[PDB]
Ligand binder design. Structure first.
Ligand SMILES: *[C@@H]1O[C@H](CO)[C@@H](O[C@@H]2O[C@H](CO)[C@@H](O)[C@H](O)[C@H]2NC(C)=O)[C@H](O)[C@H]1NC(C)=O
Ligand SMILES: *[C@@H]1O[C@H](CO)[C@@H](O)[C@H](O)[C@H]1NC(C)=O
Lengths: 48, 49
């Protein structure tokens, strides 16, 4: 009914779109690095 | 003006004739081809419905 957009279907065979599956959970994978970046030694230097 | 050619023998031949009748039927899904299984793209495709 959603694919034919008409609320009413006659006799026959029709191909329908995808409305079945939907994601529910998220997967995040990152490399494990813990060294904080030298933002203090680059942005706030003695003499630019 | 007074000469005619008339055959005296015959032959039976078999000739093949190839003809296409049908081709491959095809169906196309709009949402899978246009939007790569992403929800943000499918929210804009509805205006092109
Ligand atoms: C037409 O040609 C065929 C061969 O293509 C001839 O057929 C032969 O006929 C004789 C008797 O007439 C048979 O004994 C033979 O076996 C046939 N075949 C061959 C390969 O010789 C036929 O006679 C011809 N008709 C004519 C010339 O009137
Ligand atoms: C479907 O068709 C019937 C019969 O013509 C009609 O009465 C009905 O209103 C249609 N349904 C909707 C939801 O419009």
């Amino acid at each position: 009914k959603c694919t034919t957009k008409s609320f009413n279907v006659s006799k026959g065979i029709y191909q329908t779109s995808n409305f079945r599956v939907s994601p529910v959970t998220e997967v995040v994978r990152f490399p494990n690095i813990t060294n904080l970046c030298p933002f203090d030694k680059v942005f706030n230097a003695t003499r630019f | 003006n007074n000469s005619i050619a008339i055959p005296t023998n015959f032959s039976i031949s078999v000739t093949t004739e190839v003809m296409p009748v049908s081709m491959a039927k095809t169906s196309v899904d709009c949402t899978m081809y246009i939007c790569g299984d992403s929800l943000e793209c499918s929210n804009l495709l509805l205006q092109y419905g």
